[PDB]
Protein backbone atom coordinates (compact mmCIF):
# COMPACT_ATOMS: atom_id res chain seq x y z
CA UNK A 1 0.00 0.00 0.00
CA UNK A 2 0.72 3.94 -0.28
CA UNK A 3 0.67 3.56 3.26
CA UNK A 4 3.64 1.27 3.02
CA UNK A 5 5.68 2.94 0.94
CA UNK A 6 5.20 6.12 3.02
CA UNK A 7 6.52 4.61 6.28
CA UNK A 8 9.12 3.10 4.86
CA UNK A 9 10.38 6.38 3.25
CA UNK A 10 10.03 8.18 6.28
CA UNK A 11 12.08 5.77 8.15
CA UNK A 12 14.70 5.76 5.73
CA UNK A 13 14.55 9.33 5.62
CA UNK A 14 14.65 10.60 9.20
CA UNK A 15 14.88 7.21 11.45
CA UNK A 16 18.47 7.01 13.12
CA UNK A 17 18.45 3.34 14.45
CA UNK A 18 21.88 3.70 16.41
CA UNK A 19 20.18 6.76 18.65
CA UNK A 20 16.56 4.96 18.26
CA UNK A 21 14.97 8.67 17.61
CA UNK A 22 14.00 10.36 14.57
CA UNK A 23 16.07 13.07 13.18
CA UNK A 24 14.59 16.56 13.04
CA UNK A 25 15.36 17.13 9.71
CA UNK A 26 16.98 15.05 6.81
CA UNK A 27 20.23 16.82 7.06
CA UNK A 28 20.15 14.40 10.00
CA UNK A 29 21.80 16.60 12.91
CA UNK A 30 19.72 17.22 15.87
CA UNK A 31 16.91 14.39 16.64
CA UNK A 32 13.33 15.22 17.05
CA UNK A 33 11.88 17.83 20.44
CA UNK A 34 10.25 15.30 22.65
CA UNK A 35 6.88 16.08 22.60
CA UNK A 36 6.96 15.88 19.02
CA UNK A 37 8.89 12.40 19.29
CA UNK A 38 5.66 10.83 21.23
CA UNK A 39 3.63 11.91 18.05
CA UNK A 40 6.08 9.99 15.46
CA UNK A 41 5.80 7.04 18.28
CA UNK A 42 2.19 6.98 17.64
CA UNK A 43 2.45 7.58 13.75
CA UNK A 44 4.71 3.82 14.23
CA UNK A 45 1.70 2.58 15.91
CA UNK A 46 -0.56 3.42 13.75
CA UNK A 47 1.32 2.43 10.24
CA UNK A 48 2.14 -1.16 12.29
CA UNK A 49 -1.97 -1.30 12.76
CA UNK A 50 -2.43 -0.55 9.33
CA UNK A 51 0.08 -2.73 7.27
CA UNK A 52 0.41 -6.30 5.98
CA UNK A 53 3.44 -6.62 4.80
CA UNK A 54 5.24 -8.93 7.33
CA UNK A 55 8.77 -7.81 6.92
CA UNK A 56 7.18 -4.09 7.52
CA UNK A 57 4.40 -5.23 10.29
CA UNK A 58 7.59 -6.84 12.57
CA UNK A 59 9.86 -3.73 12.21
CA UNK A 60 7.54 -1.43 13.09
CA UNK A 61 6.75 -3.43 16.17
CA UNK A 62 10.40 -3.65 17.10
CA UNK A 63 10.44 -0.02 16.75
CA UNK A 64 7.70 0.70 19.04
CA UNK A 65 9.84 -0.54 22.27
CA UNK A 66 12.61 1.06 20.15
CA UNK A 67 11.26 4.52 20.44
CA UNK A 68 10.89 4.24 23.80
CA UNK A 69 14.51 2.97 24.42
CA UNK A 70 16.08 5.78 22.49
CA UNK A 71 13.73 8.06 24.11
CA UNK A 72 14.07 7.02 28.44
CA UNK A 73 18.13 6.86 26.85
CA UNK A 74 18.20 10.51 26.51
CA UNK A 75 15.94 12.42 28.75
CA UNK A 76 15.29 9.14 31.20
CA UNK A 77 12.57 7.35 32.39
CA UNK A 78 10.55 9.83 34.72
CA UNK A 79 9.00 12.24 33.35
CA UNK A 80 7.36 14.56 36.26
CA UNK A 81 10.42 16.84 36.27
CA UNK A 82 10.02 18.47 33.18
CA UNK A 83 8.17 21.77 33.53
CA UNK A 84 6.12 21.17 30.44
CA UNK A 85 2.61 19.39 31.56
CA UNK A 86 2.05 18.77 27.64
CA UNK A 87 5.47 16.73 27.14
CA UNK A 88 4.33 14.72 29.86
CA UNK A 89 0.81 13.98 28.77
CA UNK A 90 1.39 13.38 25.22
CA UNK A 91 4.01 10.60 26.31
CA UNK A 92 1.46 9.40 28.88
CA UNK A 93 -0.66 9.03 26.01
CA UNK A 94 2.02 7.19 23.99
CA UNK A 95 2.95 4.65 26.80
CA UNK A 96 -0.91 3.61 27.19
CA UNK A 97 -1.36 3.12 23.13
CA UNK A 98 2.30 1.26 23.90
CA UNK A 99 0.80 -0.67 26.60
CA UNK A 100 -2.30 -1.61 24.43
CA UNK A 101 -0.22 -3.46 21.56
CA UNK A 102 2.49 -5.03 23.77
CA UNK A 103 1.18 -6.18 27.00
CA UNK A 104 4.79 -5.21 28.73
CA UNK A 105 3.27 -3.16 31.70
CA UNK A 106 6.71 -1.15 31.65
CA UNK A 107 3.88 0.95 29.61
CA UNK A 108 1.51 0.38 31.73
CA UNK A 109 3.63 1.85 34.68
CA UNK A 110 4.83 4.98 32.39
CA UNK A 111 1.33 5.90 31.50
CA UNK A 112 -0.44 5.76 34.95
CA UNK A 113 2.20 7.40 36.70
CA UNK A 114 2.65 10.31 34.02
CA UNK A 115 -1.32 10.63 33.63
CA UNK A 116 -1.73 10.37 38.01
CA UNK A 117 1.43 13.13 38.19
CA UNK A 118 -0.12 15.67 35.73
CA UNK A 119 -3.84 15.07 36.49
CA UNK A 120 -3.74 14.66 40.27
CA UNK A 121 -1.44 17.97 40.88
CA UNK A 122 -1.77 19.53 37.98
CA UNK A 123 -6.26 20.19 37.83
CA UNK A 124 -7.31 23.42 39.51
CA UNK A 125 -10.49 24.54 40.30
CA UNK A 126 -9.29 28.51 41.09
CA UNK A 127 -8.27 29.10 38.03
CA UNK A 128 -11.26 29.03 34.84
CA UNK A 129 -13.03 26.77 37.33
CA UNK A 130 -12.00 23.75 36.18
CA UNK A 131 -8.83 22.74 33.83
CA UNK A 132 -5.19 21.39 33.83
CA UNK A 133 -2.22 23.94 33.42
CA UNK A 134 -0.12 24.48 30.57
CA UNK A 135 2.97 24.19 32.72
CA UNK A 136 3.91 22.78 36.13
CA UNK A 137 6.73 25.67 37.30
CA UNK A 138 4.43 28.76 36.61
CA UNK A 139 0.78 28.48 36.52
CA UNK A 140 -0.41 31.09 34.17
CA UNK A 141 -2.57 29.05 31.56
CA UNK A 142 -4.46 26.07 30.85
CA UNK A 143 -4.27 24.97 27.25
CA UNK A 144 -6.60 22.89 24.88
CA UNK A 145 -2.98 20.76 23.65
CA UNK A 146 -2.98 19.61 27.61
CA UNK A 147 -6.33 19.12 28.17
CA UNK A 148 -7.87 17.71 25.49
CA UNK A 149 -4.70 14.84 25.20
CA UNK A 150 -5.09 14.43 28.66
CA UNK A 151 -8.73 13.00 28.41
CA UNK A 152 -7.09 10.92 25.57
CA UNK A 153 -4.75 9.21 27.85
CA UNK A 154 -7.81 8.97 30.49
CA UNK A 155 -9.94 7.37 28.05
CA UNK A 156 -6.91 4.82 27.01
CA UNK A 157 -6.38 4.06 30.94
CA UNK A 158 -9.90 3.41 31.34
CA UNK A 159 -9.96 0.89 28.44
CA UNK A 160 -6.76 -1.00 30.15
CA UNK A 161 -7.52 -0.80 33.60
CA UNK A 162 -11.56 -0.84 33.64
CA UNK A 163 -11.15 1.74 36.43
CA UNK A 164 -14.26 4.50 36.32
CA UNK A 165 -11.82 6.63 38.00
CA UNK A 166 -10.21 7.16 34.41
CA UNK A 167 -13.76 7.82 32.48
CA UNK A 168 -14.78 9.95 35.25
CA UNK A 169 -11.42 11.70 34.66
CA UNK A 170 -12.12 11.97 31.20
CA UNK A 171 -15.43 13.31 31.41
CA UNK A 172 -14.19 16.00 33.74
CA UNK A 173 -11.72 16.84 31.69
CA UNK A 174 -13.69 17.02 28.78
CA UNK A 175 -16.63 18.70 30.04
CA UNK A 176 -14.72 21.35 31.08
CA UNK A 177 -13.32 21.84 27.94
CA UNK A 178 -15.81 22.20 25.86
CA UNK A 179 -17.01 25.15 28.42
CA UNK A 180 -14.19 26.98 28.58
CA UNK A 181 -11.89 25.90 25.14
CA UNK A 182 -14.61 26.17 22.53
CA UNK A 183 -16.83 28.14 21.08
CA UNK A 184 -19.62 25.37 21.60
CA UNK A 185 -20.18 24.43 18.15
CA UNK A 186 -16.76 23.13 17.43
CA UNK A 187 -14.14 25.58 17.30
CA UNK A 188 -11.55 24.30 19.94
CA UNK A 189 -9.60 27.75 21.17
CA UNK A 190 -5.51 27.69 21.58
CA UNK A 191 -5.92 28.34 25.53
CA UNK A 192 -7.15 30.76 28.45
CA UNK A 193 -4.87 33.25 30.10
CA UNK A 194 -4.68 34.40 33.21
CA UNK A 195 -3.66 38.08 32.45
CA UNK A 196 -5.38 37.78 29.04
CA UNK A 197 -8.31 35.65 28.75
CA UNK A 198 -9.31 33.35 25.89
CA UNK A 199 -7.15 32.91 22.83
CA UNK A 200 -9.92 31.29 20.51
CA UNK A 201 -7.27 30.68 17.66
CA UNK A 202 -7.88 27.35 16.12
CA UNK A 203 -5.69 25.29 14.95
CA UNK A 204 -5.08 21.37 13.43
CA UNK A 205 -3.83 19.63 16.77
CA UNK A 206 -6.31 21.30 19.15
CA UNK A 207 -8.81 20.34 16.44
CA UNK A 208 -8.06 17.05 16.08
CA UNK A 209 -7.49 15.54 20.08
CA UNK A 210 -11.14 17.24 20.84
CA UNK A 211 -12.06 15.23 18.01
CA UNK A 212 -9.97 12.11 19.21
CA UNK A 213 -11.62 12.21 22.86
CA UNK A 214 -15.06 13.33 22.45
CA UNK A 215 -15.32 9.82 20.00
CA UNK A 216 -13.64 8.26 22.54
CA UNK A 217 -16.25 9.58 25.21
CA UNK A 218 -18.96 8.73 22.83
CA UNK A 219 -17.95 5.01 22.79
CA UNK A 220 -17.75 4.71 26.44
CA UNK A 221 -20.59 6.25 27.70
CA UNK A 222 -23.21 5.88 25.10
CA UNK A 223 -24.17 9.74 24.80
CA UNK A 224 -24.63 10.69 21.57
CA UNK A 225 -24.02 14.14 22.55
CA UNK A 226 -20.15 13.51 21.90
CA UNK A 227 -20.34 12.32 18.59
CA UNK A 228 -21.96 15.57 18.11
CA UNK A 229 -19.55 17.38 19.51
CA UNK A 230 -17.13 15.57 17.39
CA UNK A 231 -18.99 16.16 14.05
CA UNK A 232 -19.15 19.96 15.04
CA UNK A 233 -15.31 20.11 15.62
CA UNK A 234 -14.72 18.36 12.19
CA UNK A 235 -17.21 20.54 10.46
CA UNK A 236 -15.18 23.45 11.95
CA UNK A 237 -12.05 21.81 10.46
CA UNK A 238 -13.25 21.36 7.00
CA UNK A 239 -14.95 24.39 6.63
CA UNK A 240 -12.81 27.12 7.84
CA UNK A 241 -8.91 25.12 8.42
CA UNK A 242 -8.44 24.93 4.57
CA UNK A 243 -7.27 27.34 1.83
CA UNK A 244 -9.53 28.01 -1.10
CA UNK A 245 -9.24 24.90 -2.50
CA UNK A 246 -10.32 22.82 0.74
CA UNK A 247 -6.93 21.69 1.08
CA UNK A 248 -5.96 21.38 4.92
CA UNK A 249 -3.82 24.85 5.85
CA UNK A 250 0.05 24.50 6.23
CA UNK A 251 0.58 26.08 9.64
CA UNK A 252 4.30 27.41 10.22
CA UNK A 253 6.45 28.56 10.31
CA UNK A 254 6.05 27.63 14.03
CA UNK A 255 8.05 24.21 14.53
CA UNK A 256 4.65 22.62 17.17
CA UNK A 257 2.22 23.56 14.61
CA UNK A 258 4.12 22.77 11.17
CA UNK A 259 3.23 18.98 12.13
CA UNK A 260 -0.05 19.10 13.95
CA UNK A 261 -1.75 17.21 10.50
CA UNK A 262 -0.09 14.38 11.72
CA UNK A 263 -2.47 14.89 15.13
CA UNK A 264 -5.81 15.99 13.09
CA UNK A 265 -5.47 12.52 10.56
CA UNK A 266 -4.66 10.57 13.40
CA UNK A 267 -7.62 11.53 14.93
CA UNK A 268 -10.45 12.28 11.59
CA UNK A 269 -9.49 8.39 11.32
CA UNK A 270 -11.26 7.71 14.79
CA UNK A 271 -14.27 9.69 13.48
CA UNK A 272 -14.29 8.59 9.71
CA UNK A 273 -14.32 4.93 11.08
CA UNK A 274 -17.13 5.69 14.00
CA UNK A 275 -19.57 7.52 11.25
CA UNK A 276 -18.95 4.63 8.54
CA UNK A 277 -20.09 1.92 11.77
CA UNK A 278 -22.83 3.34 13.31
CA UNK A 279 -24.35 4.72 9.95
CA UNK A 280 -25.01 7.86 12.01
CA UNK A 281 -24.39 11.64 10.27
CA UNK A 282 -25.00 10.27 6.99
CA UNK A 283 -25.17 13.01 4.53
CA UNK A 284 -21.95 14.53 6.62
CA UNK A 285 -20.22 11.44 6.40
CA UNK A 286 -20.78 11.11 2.67
CA UNK A 287 -19.03 15.04 2.37
CA UNK A 288 -16.49 14.19 5.29
CA UNK A 289 -15.04 10.84 2.99
CA UNK A 290 -15.01 13.03 -0.03
CA UNK A 291 -13.08 15.72 2.05
CA UNK A 292 -10.13 13.42 3.38
CA UNK A 293 -9.87 11.40 0.19
CA UNK A 294 -8.90 14.77 -1.41
CA UNK A 295 -6.72 15.71 0.99
CA UNK A 296 -5.14 12.76 1.05
CA UNK A 297 -4.51 12.14 -2.49
CA UNK A 298 -3.69 15.97 -2.96
CA UNK A 299 -0.72 14.96 0.10
CA UNK A 300 0.60 12.04 -1.65
CA UNK A 301 0.30 13.82 -5.20
CA UNK A 302 3.42 16.44 -3.49
CA UNK A 303 5.19 13.35 -2.95
CA UNK A 304 9.17 13.65 -3.84
CA UNK A 305 11.17 11.28 -5.65
CA UNK A 306 12.04 9.76 -2.24
CA UNK A 307 8.27 9.24 -1.90
CA UNK A 308 8.27 11.95 0.90
CA UNK A 309 5.82 14.67 1.64
CA UNK A 310 6.75 18.14 3.12
CA UNK A 311 3.55 19.67 5.10
CA UNK A 312 2.60 22.10 1.99
CA UNK A 313 0.12 19.22 0.66
CA UNK A 314 -0.60 22.76 -1.98
CA UNK A 315 1.93 23.81 -3.00
CA UNK A 316 5.41 23.71 -5.04
CA UNK A 317 6.99 20.64 -5.17
CA UNK A 318 10.48 21.75 -3.05
CA UNK A 319 13.89 20.59 -2.70
CA UNK A 320 16.25 21.01 -0.02
CA UNK A 321 15.72 19.92 3.62
CA UNK A 322 12.20 18.15 4.56
CA UNK A 323 11.26 17.89 8.61
CA UNK A 324 10.53 15.50 10.13
CA UNK A 325 7.06 16.84 11.98
CA UNK A 326 5.94 18.26 9.01
CA UNK A 327 6.36 15.48 6.73
CA UNK A 328 4.88 13.11 9.14
CA UNK A 329 1.31 14.18 8.16
CA UNK A 330 1.00 12.71 5.04
CA UNK A 331 2.63 8.89 6.47
CA UNK A 332 -0.18 9.34 8.95
CA UNK A 333 -3.01 9.98 6.41
CA UNK A 334 -1.89 7.10 4.18
CA UNK A 335 -1.82 4.85 7.56
CA UNK A 336 -5.37 5.37 8.40
O1 LIG B 1 -2.91 29.69 16.79
C1 LIG B 1 -2.71 29.13 18.08
C2 LIG B 1 -1.33 29.51 18.64
O2 LIG B 1 -0.34 29.02 17.74
C3 LIG B 1 1.09 29.26 18.12
O3 LIG B 1 1.26 28.61 19.36
C4 LIG B 1 1.45 27.14 19.16
C5 LIG B 1 1.42 26.48 20.53
O4 LIG B 1 2.42 27.11 21.35
C6 LIG B 1 2.50 26.55 22.70
O5 LIG B 1 2.98 25.24 22.67
C7 LIG B 1 1.17 26.71 23.44
O6 LIG B 1 0.84 28.08 23.62
C8 LIG B 1 0.15 25.95 22.62
O7 LIG B 1 -1.13 26.12 23.27
C9 LIG B 1 0.09 26.57 21.23
O8 LIG B 1 -0.86 25.88 20.39
C10 LIG B 1 1.30 30.74 18.37
O9 LIG B 1 1.16 31.37 17.13
C11 LIG B 1 0.19 31.30 19.31
O10 LIG B 1 0.28 32.79 19.40
C12 LIG B 1 -1.19 31.04 18.77
O11 LIG B 1 -2.15 31.44 19.81
Not at 61 to 81: E, L, P, R, S
Not at 158 to 177: Q, S, V
Not at 198 to 210: M, R
Request: negative net charge.
Amino acid sequence: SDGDTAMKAFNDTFWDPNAKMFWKDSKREKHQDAWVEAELWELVMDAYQHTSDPALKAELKTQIDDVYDGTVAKYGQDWTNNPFNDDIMWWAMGSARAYQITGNPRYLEAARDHFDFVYDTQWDEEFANGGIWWLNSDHNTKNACINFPAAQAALYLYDITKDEHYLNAATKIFRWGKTMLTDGNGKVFDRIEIEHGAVPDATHYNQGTYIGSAVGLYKATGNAVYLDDAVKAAKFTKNHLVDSNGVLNYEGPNGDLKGGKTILMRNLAHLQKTLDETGQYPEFSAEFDEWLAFNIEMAWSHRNSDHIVDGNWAGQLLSGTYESWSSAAAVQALNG
